[PDB]
């Protein structure tokens, strides 16, 4: 489980992003996301992340979930 | 690599048989280094009035980074 925690640079232009949309056949709208982990960076129509750091977080046993064992 | 400094960077740091990276402003910069230093392949050069030599040396170092930067 990871949380985010740094990014280094991110960097947003709504003009471009306009642009960079598309519309599928579904009527929807959406938009290329690309991941390039040897550089850090994620891309998606008009924003683009740098060195977005995520990291680990506890998972927290909720005890209104304990399993009757039989 | 184009100036004083730079230079002798390179003409030692090649002596010690190292992949090198440099950073230029100049177009022609390119080219003065590459013909005095053969050794340079054209992987050796990135821009160095920008950010983009991060992503450049992240390439063709497969994520890993380089082992001494000056």
């Given at each position: 489980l990871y949380l985010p925690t740094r990014f280094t640079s991110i960097r947003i232009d709504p003009?471009?992003?306009?642009?960079?949309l598309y519309t599928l056949?579904?009527?929807?709208?959406?938009?290329?996301?690309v991941v390039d982990?040897?550089?850090?960076?994620?891309v998606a129509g008009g924003a683009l992340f740098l060195g977005?750091?995520?990291?680990?977080?506890?998972?927290?046993?909720?005890?209104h979930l304990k399993p009757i064992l039989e | 690599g184009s100036g004083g400094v730079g230079q002798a960077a390179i003409a030692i740091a090649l002596s010690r048989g190292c992949r090198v990276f440099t950073t230029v402003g100049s177009a022609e910069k390119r080219a003065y280094?590459?013909?005095?230093?053969?050794?340079?392949?054209?992987?050796?050069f990135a821009n160095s009035?920008?950010?983009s030599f991060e992503q450049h040396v992240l390439r063709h170092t497969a994520?890993?980074?380089?082992?001494?930067?000056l």
């Open positions: 003009v471009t992003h306009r642009q960079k056949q579904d009527t929807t709208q959406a938009a290329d996301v982990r040897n550089l850090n960076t994620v977005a750091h995520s990291s680990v977080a506890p998972r927290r046993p909720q005890e | 280094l590459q013909a005095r230093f053969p050794q340079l392949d054209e992987t050796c009035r920008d950010t994520g890993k980074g380089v082992d001494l930067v």
